């Protein structure tokens, strides 16, 4: 069992506000098959999905000087099923005009996804769904979008105020601040890890892997599969603008994955620092090709 550092010394989780009416945004965008989107290149040789699900990350409430409580949606109450898998699309509508969610508008920026994959799911003591039992595999972006951590461990909820096993609990979220956690040269790689440790305690960690990612503004696709050997990660290093997945890591996960969870995110910023963020899409990998080599696909039905 690896060592992951200490745990949070805070005695009360930060307050979280949940809203849906201000978060139910209609941005209809289907998927076109002949776009080289979410197509995993065959492995070992050289020669597939729909509106989908949308997830929004927004900065928390704030005043003129000091930021207020967080602001998330009910992206943790809903729990979905892994089945064969799903395809991940990030950085869709950047470089354009978007509202700050919280009339005001700005340029849309890019965000990175965090996942929690496990086999047994229930609900908390309060009666709210989103609790994962036994081992869980968590993929957490770190370093203000310049690092990815992937660990395998059990999660124990905490009994402080606003924490999952405490009083007056709405949801658990990740947060970070741009003034301190992100800086030129002096980037903090353990911000979101500390935000995660604020709510849950990580016990019996079999493995913890790190991958370094360069900053960009490129629309991206991602995927994860499981076979008899282990969990295969399908991204960047070989293809960057064509959107063709490739393998970069194998994770020793032998239990069957049946459910996955998305973790909401927020940035502690004041009104003058509000920047709009990009919607993050996930499409079901229902089991159902023109080459250039890279593929540049038509639905049979």
């Amino acid at each position: 069992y690896v060592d992951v550092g200490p745990d949070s010394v805070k005695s009360a989780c930060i307050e979280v506000d949940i809203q849906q009416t201000f978060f139910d945004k209609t941005w209809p965008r289907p998927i076109d098959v002949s776009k080289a989107d979410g197509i995993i290149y065959p492995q070992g040789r050289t020669y597939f999905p729909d509106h989908g699900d949308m997830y929004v990350y927004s900065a928390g409430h704030a005043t003129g000087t000091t930021p207020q409580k967080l602001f998330v949606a009910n992206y943790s109450q809903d729990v979905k099923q892994f089945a064969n898998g799903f395809v991940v699309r990030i950085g869709a509508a950047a470089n354009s005009t978007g509202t700050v969610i919280i009339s005001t508008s700005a340029t849309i920026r890019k965000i990175y996804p965090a996942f929690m994959l496990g086999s047994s799911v229930g609900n908390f003591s309060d009666g709210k769904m989103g609790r994962f039992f036994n081992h869980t595999l968590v993929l957490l972006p770190d370093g203000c979008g310049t690092l990815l951590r992937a660990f395998y461990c059990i999660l124990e909820p905490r009994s402080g105020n606003h924490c999952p096993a405490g009083n007056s609990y709405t949801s658990f979220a990740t947060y970070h601040t741009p003034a301190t956690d992100c800086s030129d040269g002096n980037y903090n790689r353990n911000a979101s890890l500390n935000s995660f440790k604020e709510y849950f305690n990580l016990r019996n960690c079999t493995f913890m892997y790190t991958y370094n990612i360069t900053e960009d503004e490129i629309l991206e696709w991602f995927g994860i599969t499981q076979t008899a050997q282990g969990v295969h990660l399908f991204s960047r290093y070989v293809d960057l603008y064509g959107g063709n997945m490739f393998q970069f890591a194998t994770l020793p996960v032998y239990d069957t994955i049946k459910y996955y969870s998305i973790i909401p995110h927020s940035i502690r910023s004041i009104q003058s620092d509000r920047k709009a963020w990009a919607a993050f899409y996930v499409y079901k990998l229902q089991p159902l090709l023109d080459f250039s080599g890279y593929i540049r696909a038509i639905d049979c039905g």
Partner: antibody
Amino acid sequence: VQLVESGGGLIQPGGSLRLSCAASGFTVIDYYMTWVRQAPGKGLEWVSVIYAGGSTYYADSVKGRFTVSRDYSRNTLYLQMNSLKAEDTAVYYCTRDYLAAGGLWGQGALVTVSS
Amino acid sequence: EIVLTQSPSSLSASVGDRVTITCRASQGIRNNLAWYQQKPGQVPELLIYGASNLKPGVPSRFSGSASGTDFTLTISSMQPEDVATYYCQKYDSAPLTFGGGTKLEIKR
């Protein structure tokens, strides 16, 4: 990390006052902070709490007279007292969140309400 | 409303004894009970968080105990130094109510 307080002295009854607590080594917005008073020769008492997210909770014996806030730019914690009476004469402290509520503690400021 | 009754309010100790204090409450507070130590003439300090966990600053002699309904703050051995006033607090919810502080002494 340290906390230094100021703003205490003799005050006539029926008048206001302010207490300021300056924090070094961290930022105020990270952790919740608590104002706690202690009467001379009596026990400890909890005056107010401010949580990350601007949610403030006051005690019943001080409700309607005291107010707690904080300033981000100066990294300060403020407590304003109005309609003071002779009962509100005590040593006050500002405390920072840690393993427990009172992990860091402060130095103390004496407030005397008399004519 | 949850009330925190710290007993005994005055503690008499000898050259040989193990401090044992209790903190009765009228409701459920999860385990969010904090035990503080105040040397008279100085600001108090934290002893134990969660009624069973130890602060890294404090040593391992002052060992907490379980909390069924009452909360026991045990101490392995009695020393001339440990003379202070020990306080309870419930940081479980909005009213963080205190109680009475128990003065310790050394036999002579």
